Short mmCIF file of C-alpha atoms in Angstrom, two decimals:
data_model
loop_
_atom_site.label_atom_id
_atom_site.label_comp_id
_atom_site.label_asym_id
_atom_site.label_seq_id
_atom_site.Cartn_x
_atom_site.Cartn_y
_atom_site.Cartn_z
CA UNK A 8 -2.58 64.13 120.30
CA UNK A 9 -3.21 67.65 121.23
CA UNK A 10 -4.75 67.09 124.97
CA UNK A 11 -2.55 68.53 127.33
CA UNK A 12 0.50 66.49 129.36
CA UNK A 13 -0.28 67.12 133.01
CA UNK A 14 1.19 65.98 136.80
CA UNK A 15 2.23 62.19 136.18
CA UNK A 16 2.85 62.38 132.45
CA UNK A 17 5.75 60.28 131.49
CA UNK A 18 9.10 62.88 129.87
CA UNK A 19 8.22 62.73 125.92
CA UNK A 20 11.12 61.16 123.83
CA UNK A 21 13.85 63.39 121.97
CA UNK A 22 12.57 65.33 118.85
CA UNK A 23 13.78 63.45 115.72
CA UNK A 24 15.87 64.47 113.19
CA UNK A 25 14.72 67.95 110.78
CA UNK A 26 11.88 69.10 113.34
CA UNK A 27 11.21 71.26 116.27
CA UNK A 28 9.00 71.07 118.90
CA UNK A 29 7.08 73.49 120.69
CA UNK A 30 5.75 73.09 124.18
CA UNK A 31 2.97 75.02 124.27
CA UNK A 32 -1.14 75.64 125.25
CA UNK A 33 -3.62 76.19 122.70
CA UNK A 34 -4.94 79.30 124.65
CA UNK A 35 -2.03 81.01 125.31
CA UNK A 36 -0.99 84.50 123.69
CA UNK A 37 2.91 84.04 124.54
CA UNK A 38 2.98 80.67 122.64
CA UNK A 39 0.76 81.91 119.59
CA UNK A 40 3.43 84.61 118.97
CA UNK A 41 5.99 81.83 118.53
CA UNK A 42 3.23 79.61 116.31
CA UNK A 43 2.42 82.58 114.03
CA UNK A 44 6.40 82.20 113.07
CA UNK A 45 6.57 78.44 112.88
CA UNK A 46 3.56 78.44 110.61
CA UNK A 47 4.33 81.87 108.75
CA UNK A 48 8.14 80.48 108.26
CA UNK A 49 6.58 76.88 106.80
CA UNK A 50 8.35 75.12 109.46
CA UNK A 51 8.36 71.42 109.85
CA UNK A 52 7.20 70.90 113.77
CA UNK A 53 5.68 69.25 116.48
CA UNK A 54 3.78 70.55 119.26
CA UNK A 55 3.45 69.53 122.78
CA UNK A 56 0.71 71.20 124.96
CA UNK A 57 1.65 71.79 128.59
CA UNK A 58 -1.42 71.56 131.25
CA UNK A 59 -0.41 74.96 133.00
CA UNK A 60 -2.83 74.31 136.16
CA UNK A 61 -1.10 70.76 136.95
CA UNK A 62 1.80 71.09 135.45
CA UNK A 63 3.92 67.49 134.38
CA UNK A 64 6.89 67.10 137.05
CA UNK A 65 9.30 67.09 133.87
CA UNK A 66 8.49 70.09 132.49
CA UNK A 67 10.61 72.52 134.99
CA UNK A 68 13.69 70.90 133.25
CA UNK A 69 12.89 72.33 130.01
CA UNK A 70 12.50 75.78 131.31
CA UNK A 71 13.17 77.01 134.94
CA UNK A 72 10.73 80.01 134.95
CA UNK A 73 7.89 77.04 134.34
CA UNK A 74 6.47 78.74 131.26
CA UNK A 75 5.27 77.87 127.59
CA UNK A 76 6.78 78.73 125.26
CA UNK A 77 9.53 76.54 124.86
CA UNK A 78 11.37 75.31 122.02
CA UNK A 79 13.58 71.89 121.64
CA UNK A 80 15.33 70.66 118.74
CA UNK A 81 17.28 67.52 118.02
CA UNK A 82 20.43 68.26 119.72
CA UNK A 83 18.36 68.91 122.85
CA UNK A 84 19.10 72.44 122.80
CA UNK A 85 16.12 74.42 124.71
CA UNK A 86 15.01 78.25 124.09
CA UNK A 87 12.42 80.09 126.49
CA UNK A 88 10.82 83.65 126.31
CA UNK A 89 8.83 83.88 123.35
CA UNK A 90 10.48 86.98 121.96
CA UNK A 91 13.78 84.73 122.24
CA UNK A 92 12.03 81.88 120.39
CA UNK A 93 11.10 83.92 117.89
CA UNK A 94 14.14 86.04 117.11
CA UNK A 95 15.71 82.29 116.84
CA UNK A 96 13.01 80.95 114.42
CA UNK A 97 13.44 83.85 112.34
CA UNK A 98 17.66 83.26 112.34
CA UNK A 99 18.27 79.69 112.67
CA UNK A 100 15.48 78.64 109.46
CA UNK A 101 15.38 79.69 105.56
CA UNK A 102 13.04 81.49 103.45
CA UNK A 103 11.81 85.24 104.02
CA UNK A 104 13.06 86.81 107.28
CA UNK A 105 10.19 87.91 109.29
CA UNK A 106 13.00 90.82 111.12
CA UNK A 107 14.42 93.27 108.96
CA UNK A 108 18.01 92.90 108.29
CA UNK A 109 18.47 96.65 108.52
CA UNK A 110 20.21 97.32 111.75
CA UNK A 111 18.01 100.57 112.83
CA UNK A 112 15.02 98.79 110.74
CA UNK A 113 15.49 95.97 113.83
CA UNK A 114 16.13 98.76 116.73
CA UNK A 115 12.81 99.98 115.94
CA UNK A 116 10.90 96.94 116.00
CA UNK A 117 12.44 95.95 119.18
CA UNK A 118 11.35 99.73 120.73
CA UNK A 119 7.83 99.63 119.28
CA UNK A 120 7.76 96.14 121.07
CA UNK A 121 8.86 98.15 124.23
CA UNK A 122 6.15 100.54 123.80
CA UNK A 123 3.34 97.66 123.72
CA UNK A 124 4.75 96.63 126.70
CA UNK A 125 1.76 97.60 129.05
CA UNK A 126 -0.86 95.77 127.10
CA UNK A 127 -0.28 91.95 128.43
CA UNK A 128 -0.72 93.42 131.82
CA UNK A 129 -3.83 95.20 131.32
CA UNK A 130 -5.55 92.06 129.10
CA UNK A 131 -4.22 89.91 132.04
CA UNK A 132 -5.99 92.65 134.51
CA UNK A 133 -9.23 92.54 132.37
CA UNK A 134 -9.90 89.20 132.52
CA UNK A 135 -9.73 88.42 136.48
CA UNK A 136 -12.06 89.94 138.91
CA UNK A 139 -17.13 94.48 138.35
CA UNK A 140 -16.55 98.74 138.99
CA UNK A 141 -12.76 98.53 137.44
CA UNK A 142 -13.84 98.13 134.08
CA UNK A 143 -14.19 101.68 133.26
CA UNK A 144 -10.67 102.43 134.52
CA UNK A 145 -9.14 99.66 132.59
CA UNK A 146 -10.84 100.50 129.35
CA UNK A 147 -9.39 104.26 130.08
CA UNK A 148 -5.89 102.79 130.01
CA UNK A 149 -6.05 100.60 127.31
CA UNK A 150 -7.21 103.73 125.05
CA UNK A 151 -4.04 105.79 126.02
CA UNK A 152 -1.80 102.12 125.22
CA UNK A 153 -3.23 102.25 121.90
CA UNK A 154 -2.97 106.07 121.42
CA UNK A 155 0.91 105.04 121.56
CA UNK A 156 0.84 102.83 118.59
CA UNK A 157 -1.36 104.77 116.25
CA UNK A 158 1.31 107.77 116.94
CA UNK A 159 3.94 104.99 115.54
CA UNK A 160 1.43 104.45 112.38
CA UNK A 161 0.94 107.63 112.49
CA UNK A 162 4.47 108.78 111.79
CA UNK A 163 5.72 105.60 109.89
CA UNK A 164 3.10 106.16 107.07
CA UNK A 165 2.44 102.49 106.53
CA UNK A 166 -0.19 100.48 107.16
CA UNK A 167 1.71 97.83 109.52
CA UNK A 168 4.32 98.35 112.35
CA UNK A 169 7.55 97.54 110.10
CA UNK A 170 6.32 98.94 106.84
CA UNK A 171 3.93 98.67 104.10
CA UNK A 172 3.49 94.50 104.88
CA UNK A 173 3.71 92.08 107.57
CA UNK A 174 6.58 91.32 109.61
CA UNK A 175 7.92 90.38 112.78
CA UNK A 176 6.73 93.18 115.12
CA UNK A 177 3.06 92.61 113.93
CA UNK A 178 2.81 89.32 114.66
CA UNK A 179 4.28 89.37 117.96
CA UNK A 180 1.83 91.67 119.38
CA UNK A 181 -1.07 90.26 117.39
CA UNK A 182 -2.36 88.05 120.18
CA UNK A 183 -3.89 90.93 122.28
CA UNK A 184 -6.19 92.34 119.59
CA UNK A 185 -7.10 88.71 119.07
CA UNK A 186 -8.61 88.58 122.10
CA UNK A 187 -9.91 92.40 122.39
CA UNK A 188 -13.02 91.21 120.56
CA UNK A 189 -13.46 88.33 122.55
CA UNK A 190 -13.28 90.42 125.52
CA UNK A 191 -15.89 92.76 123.67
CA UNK A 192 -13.51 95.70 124.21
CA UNK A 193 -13.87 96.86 120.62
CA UNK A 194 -14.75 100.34 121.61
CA UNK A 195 -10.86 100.59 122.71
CA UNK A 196 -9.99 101.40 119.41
CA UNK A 197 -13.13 103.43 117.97
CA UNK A 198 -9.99 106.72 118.64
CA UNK A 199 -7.43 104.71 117.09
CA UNK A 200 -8.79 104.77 113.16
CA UNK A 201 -5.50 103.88 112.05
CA UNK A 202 -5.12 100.83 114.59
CA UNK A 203 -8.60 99.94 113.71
CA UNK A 204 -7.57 99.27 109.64
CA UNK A 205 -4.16 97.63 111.16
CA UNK A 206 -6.73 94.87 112.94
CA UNK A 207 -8.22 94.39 109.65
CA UNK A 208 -5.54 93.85 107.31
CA UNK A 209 -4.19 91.21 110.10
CA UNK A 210 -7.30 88.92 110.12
CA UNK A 211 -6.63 88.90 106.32
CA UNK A 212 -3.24 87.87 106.53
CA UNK A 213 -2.95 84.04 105.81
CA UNK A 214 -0.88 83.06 108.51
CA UNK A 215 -3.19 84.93 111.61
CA UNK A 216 -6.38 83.56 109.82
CA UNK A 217 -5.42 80.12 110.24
CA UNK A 218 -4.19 80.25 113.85
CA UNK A 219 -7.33 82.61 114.95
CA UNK A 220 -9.62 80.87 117.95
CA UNK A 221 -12.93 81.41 117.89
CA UNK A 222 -14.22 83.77 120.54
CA UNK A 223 -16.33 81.13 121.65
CA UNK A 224 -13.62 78.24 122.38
CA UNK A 225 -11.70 81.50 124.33
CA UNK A 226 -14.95 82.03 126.15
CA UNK A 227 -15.34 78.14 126.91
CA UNK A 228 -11.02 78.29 128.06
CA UNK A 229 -11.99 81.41 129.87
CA UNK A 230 -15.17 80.28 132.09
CA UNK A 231 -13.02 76.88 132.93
CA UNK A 232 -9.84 78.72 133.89
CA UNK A 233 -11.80 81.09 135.93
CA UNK A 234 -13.70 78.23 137.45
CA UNK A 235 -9.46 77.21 138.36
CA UNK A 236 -10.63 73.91 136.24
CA UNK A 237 -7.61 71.79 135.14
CA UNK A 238 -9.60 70.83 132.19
CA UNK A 239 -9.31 74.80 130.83
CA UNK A 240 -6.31 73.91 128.55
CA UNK A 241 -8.02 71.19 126.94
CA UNK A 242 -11.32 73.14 126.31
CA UNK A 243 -13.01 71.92 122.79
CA UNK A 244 -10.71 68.70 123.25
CA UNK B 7 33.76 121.41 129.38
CA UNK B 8 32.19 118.76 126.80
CA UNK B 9 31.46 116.49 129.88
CA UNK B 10 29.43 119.15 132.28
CA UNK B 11 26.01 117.53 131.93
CA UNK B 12 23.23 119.78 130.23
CA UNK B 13 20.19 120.69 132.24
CA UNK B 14 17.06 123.18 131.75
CA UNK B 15 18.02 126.23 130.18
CA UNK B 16 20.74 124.96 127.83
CA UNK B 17 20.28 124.92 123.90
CA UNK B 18 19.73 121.88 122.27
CA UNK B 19 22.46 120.02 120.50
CA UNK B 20 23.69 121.33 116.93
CA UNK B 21 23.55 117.98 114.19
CA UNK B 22 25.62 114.92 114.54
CA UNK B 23 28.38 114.93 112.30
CA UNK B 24 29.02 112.58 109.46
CA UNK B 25 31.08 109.18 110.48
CA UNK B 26 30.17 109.68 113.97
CA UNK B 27 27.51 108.97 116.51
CA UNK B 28 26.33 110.71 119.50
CA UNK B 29 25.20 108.73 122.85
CA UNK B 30 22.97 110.39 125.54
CA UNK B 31 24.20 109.54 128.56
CA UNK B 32 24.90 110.39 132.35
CA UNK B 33 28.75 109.11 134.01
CA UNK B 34 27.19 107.45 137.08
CA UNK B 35 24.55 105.75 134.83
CA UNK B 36 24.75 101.67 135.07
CA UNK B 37 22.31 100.91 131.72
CA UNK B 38 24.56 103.58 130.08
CA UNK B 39 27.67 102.38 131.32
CA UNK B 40 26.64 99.18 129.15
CA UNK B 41 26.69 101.40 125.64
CA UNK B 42 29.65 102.91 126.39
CA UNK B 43 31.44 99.84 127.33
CA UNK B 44 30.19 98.56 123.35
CA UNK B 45 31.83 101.76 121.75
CA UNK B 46 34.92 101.98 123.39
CA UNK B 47 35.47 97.68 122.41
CA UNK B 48 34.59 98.33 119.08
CA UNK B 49 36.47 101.14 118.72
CA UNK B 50 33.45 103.59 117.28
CA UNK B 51 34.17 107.31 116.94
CA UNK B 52 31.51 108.97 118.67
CA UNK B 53 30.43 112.06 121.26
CA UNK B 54 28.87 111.81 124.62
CA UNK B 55 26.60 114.26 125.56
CA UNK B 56 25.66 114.05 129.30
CA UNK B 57 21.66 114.83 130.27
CA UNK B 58 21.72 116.24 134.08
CA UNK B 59 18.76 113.81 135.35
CA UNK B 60 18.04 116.14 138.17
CA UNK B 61 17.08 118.96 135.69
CA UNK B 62 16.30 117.52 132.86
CA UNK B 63 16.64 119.58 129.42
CA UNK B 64 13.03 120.14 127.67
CA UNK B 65 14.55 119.33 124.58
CA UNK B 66 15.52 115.88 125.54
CA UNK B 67 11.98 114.16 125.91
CA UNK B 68 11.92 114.48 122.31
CA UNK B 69 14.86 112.29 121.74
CA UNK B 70 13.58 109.46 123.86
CA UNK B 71 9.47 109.35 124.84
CA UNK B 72 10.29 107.42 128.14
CA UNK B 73 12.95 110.04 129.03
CA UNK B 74 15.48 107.76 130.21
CA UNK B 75 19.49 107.62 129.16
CA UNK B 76 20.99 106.14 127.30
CA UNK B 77 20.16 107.20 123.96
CA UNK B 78 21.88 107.03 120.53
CA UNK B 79 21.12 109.67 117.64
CA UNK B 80 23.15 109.43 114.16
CA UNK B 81 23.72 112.01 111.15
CA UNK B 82 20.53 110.94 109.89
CA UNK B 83 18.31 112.28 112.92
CA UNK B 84 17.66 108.19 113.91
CA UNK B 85 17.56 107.59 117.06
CA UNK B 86 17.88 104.55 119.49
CA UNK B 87 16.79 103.91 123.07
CA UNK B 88 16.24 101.14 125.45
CA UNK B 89 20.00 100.11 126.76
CA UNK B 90 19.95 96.39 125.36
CA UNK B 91 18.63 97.64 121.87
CA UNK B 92 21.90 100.45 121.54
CA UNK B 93 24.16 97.11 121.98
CA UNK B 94 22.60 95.13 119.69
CA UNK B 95 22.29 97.90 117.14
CA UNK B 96 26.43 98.81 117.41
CA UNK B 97 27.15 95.23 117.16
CA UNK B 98 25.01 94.81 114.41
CA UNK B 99 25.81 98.58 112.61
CA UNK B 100 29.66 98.86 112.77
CA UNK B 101 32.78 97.08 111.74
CA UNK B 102 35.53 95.00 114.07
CA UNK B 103 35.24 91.70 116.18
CA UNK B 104 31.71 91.07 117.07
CA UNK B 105 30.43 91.09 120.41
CA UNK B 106 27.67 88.85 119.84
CA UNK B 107 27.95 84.85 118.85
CA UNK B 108 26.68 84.64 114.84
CA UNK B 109 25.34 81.01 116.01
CA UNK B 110 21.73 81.63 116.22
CA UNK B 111 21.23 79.16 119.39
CA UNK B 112 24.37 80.85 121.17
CA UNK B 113 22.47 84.23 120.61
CA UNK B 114 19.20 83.31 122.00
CA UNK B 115 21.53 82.08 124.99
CA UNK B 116 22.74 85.45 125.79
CA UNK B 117 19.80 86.82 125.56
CA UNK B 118 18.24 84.30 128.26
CA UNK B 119 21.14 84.73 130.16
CA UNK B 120 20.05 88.05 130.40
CA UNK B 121 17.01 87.50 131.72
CA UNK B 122 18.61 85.17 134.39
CA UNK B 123 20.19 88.39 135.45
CA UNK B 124 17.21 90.50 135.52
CA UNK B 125 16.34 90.78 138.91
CA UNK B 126 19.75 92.26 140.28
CA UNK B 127 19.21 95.69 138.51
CA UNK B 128 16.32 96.45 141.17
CA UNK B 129 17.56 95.33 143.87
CA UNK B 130 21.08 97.55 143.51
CA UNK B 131 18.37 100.81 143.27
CA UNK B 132 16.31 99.35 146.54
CA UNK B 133 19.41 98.78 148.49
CA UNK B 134 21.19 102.06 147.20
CA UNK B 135 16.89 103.63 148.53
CA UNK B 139 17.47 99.09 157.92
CA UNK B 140 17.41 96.20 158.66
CA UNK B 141 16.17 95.81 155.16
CA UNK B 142 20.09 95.09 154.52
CA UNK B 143 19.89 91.30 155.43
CA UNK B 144 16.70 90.99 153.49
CA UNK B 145 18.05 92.59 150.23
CA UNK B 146 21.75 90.76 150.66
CA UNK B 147 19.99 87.37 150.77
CA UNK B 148 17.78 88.23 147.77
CA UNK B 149 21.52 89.33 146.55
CA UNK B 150 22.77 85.80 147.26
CA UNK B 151 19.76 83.80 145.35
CA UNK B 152 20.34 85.75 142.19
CA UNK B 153 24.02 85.03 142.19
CA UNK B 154 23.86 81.33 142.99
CA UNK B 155 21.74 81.56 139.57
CA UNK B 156 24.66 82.91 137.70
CA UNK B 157 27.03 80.93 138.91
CA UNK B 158 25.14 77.84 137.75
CA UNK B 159 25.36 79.04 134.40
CA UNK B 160 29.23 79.29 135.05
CA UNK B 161 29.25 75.70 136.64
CA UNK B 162 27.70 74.28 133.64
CA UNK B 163 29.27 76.52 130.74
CA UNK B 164 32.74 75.33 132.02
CA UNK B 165 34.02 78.64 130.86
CA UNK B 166 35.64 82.01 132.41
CA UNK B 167 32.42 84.23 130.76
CA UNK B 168 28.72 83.88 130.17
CA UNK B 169 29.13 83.49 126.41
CA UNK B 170 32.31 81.41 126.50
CA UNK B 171 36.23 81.74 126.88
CA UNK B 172 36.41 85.47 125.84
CA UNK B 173 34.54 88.18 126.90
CA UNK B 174 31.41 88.59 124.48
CA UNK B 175 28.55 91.16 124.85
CA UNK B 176 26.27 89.36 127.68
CA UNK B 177 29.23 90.00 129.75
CA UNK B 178 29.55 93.62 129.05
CA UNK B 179 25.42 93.87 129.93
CA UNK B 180 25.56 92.51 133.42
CA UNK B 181 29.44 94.24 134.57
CA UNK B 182 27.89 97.60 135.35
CA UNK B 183 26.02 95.46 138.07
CA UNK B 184 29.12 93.84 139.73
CA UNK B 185 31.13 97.10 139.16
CA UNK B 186 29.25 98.94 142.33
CA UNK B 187 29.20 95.86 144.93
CA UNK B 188 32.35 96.70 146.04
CA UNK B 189 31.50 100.88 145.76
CA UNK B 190 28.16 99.00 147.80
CA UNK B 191 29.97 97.17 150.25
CA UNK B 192 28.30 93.68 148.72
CA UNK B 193 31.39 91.85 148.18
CA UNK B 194 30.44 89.27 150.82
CA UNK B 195 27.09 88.66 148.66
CA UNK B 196 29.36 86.49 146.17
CA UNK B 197 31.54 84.79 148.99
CA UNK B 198 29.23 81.65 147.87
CA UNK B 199 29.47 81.88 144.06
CA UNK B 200 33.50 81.25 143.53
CA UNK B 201 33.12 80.92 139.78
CA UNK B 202 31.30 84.00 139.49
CA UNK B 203 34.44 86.01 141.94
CA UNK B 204 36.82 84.64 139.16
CA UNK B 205 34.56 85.74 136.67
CA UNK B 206 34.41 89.95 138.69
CA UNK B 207 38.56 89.48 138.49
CA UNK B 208 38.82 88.27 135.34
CA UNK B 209 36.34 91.29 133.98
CA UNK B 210 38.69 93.99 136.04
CA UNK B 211 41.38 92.91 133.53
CA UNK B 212 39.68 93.28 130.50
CA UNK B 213 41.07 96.60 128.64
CA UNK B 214 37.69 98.15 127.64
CA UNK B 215 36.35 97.26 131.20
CA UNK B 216 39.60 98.80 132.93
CA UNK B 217 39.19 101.92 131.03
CA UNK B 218 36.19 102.47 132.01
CA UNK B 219 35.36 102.16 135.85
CA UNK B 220 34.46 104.70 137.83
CA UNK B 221 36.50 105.22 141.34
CA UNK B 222 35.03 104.37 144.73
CA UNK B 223 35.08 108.03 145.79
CA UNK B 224 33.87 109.43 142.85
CA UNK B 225 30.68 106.90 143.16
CA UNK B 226 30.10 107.52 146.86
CA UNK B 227 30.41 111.39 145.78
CA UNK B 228 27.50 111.11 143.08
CA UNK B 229 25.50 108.78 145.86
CA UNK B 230 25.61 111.69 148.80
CA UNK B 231 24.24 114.42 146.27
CA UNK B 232 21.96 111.96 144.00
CA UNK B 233 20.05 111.28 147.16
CA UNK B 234 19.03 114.41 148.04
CA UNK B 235 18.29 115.57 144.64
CA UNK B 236 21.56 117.61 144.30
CA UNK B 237 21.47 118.75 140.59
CA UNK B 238 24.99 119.12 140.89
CA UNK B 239 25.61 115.21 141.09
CA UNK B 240 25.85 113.52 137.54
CA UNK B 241 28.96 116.69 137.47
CA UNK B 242 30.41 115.19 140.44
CA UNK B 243 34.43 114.72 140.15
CA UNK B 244 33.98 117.04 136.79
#
């Protein structure tokens, strides 16, 4: 049920009545934001994983940009761009809201996300292609620098205050991998950062979406190898 | 004059009074235009102070750490960058008819409609930076023909429906210099989308707004060769 739907796969069925489903791949940072939410939220879903190498013919109707993640309901309604997905989990689904209702409380989360920005790029970076290492580490300390300032100033031990919300677990999925990477010593300047990490892999919601750095490592070497078996790594 | 933009040299700005807001801006800015064209709809008392971004005021990068316009700064000392997040936050932070749908779904669509757009924002600053014309007008052509499938199947005058809404009010600033640009013929393809320029032109908070031909082409001559006299062109 959760092997990936490649090139030839047959267009899945509409999503039934009081669930959501999530197209998706297991490995995939973008798409874990958007699962920390569904799972953090208790939503009732289903999830469809997308082979991203060999990609299913139907799948470019459900987004045009080609990319997981993507949300469908029952009405057929589709949302792409995982910051979009989640924003819409977040409005469209009771219980605790994961976004301040504050309106500068909200601005702020939305700028810190700004100011992660360069982080994807450099993970991304990182992993392909080695005498750039060195350089790369160098950025990702000044990156980091940026958000222990924002600790620094906001005087709480998480991005939007003194617990969990939104903002932390949308740019979660990067220090996820950082140890897999074994790019610890990134944040050995960043004390405040460094307790941030911790207090994450305690909350309940990251622990029980957390991949072992050894299924990322066995994703990794197949994607590298340009296997289409990568998504399905560990089956 | 309250409108001469402020450069190196001048003192920084005295406190924001109470029931008003300031926005940090610059007349010949397009991401700035977009604030502006949010408080003058919903009708918010505020102050525009103009930053000359040819001689930029050392007191300014402490208002915004990317040092961009525009910027929003209340009574309280908060302030707001990043041109999408100062819409969302008036919307959100002051009385009158919304700008943005409450339907959660109809939100997330502006928001990817938004993306949809994002390409056209460069290309306006690399055609405005030959023989590179035909290039940059077909590029022009491709990201219109986008658009105006969203028109085709929305059925409607606007992005968000049959009034004017905030995605509309994003991407105007855009279609407000083709004709300044002498693009016009880069929507002779896109019909819906022409209707769509007309229909915007008519709007009252729109209208109020634009800035002349000649006063544009006067800010253009001096912004190109680094004139610090050109965000006071026209006075």
């Amino acid at each position: 049920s959760a092997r990936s739907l490649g090139k030839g796969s047959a267009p899945p069925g509409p999503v039934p009545e009081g669930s959501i489903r999530i197209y998706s791949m297991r490995f995939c940072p973008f798409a874990e934001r958007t699962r920390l939410v569904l799972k953090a939220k208790g939503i009732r879903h289903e999830v469809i994983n997308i082979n991203l190498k060999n990609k299913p013919e139907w799948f470019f109707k459900k987004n045009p940009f080609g990319l997981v993640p993507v949300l469908e309901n029952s009405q057929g309604q589709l949302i792409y761009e995982s910051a979009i997905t989640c924003e819409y989990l977040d409005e469209a689904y009771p219980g605790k809201k994961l976004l301040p209702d504050d309106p500068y409380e909200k601005a702020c989360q939305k700028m810190i996300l700004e100011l992660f920005s360069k982080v994807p790029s450099l993970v991304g970076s990182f992993i392909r292609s080695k005498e750039d290492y060195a350089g790369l580490k160098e950025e990702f300390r000044k990156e980091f620098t940026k958000l222990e300032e924002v600790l620094t100033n906001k005087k709480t031990t998480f991005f939007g205050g003194n617990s969990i919300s939104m903002i932390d677990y949308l740019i979660w999925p990067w220090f996820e991998r950082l140890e897999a990477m074994k790019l610890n010593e990134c944040v050995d300047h960043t004390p405040k950062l460094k307790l941030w990490m911790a207090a994450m892999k305690e909350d309940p919601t990251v622990s029980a979406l957390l991949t072992s750095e050894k299924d990322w490592q066995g994703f990794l070497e197949l994607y590298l190898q340009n296997s289409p078996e990568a998504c399905d790594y560990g089956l």
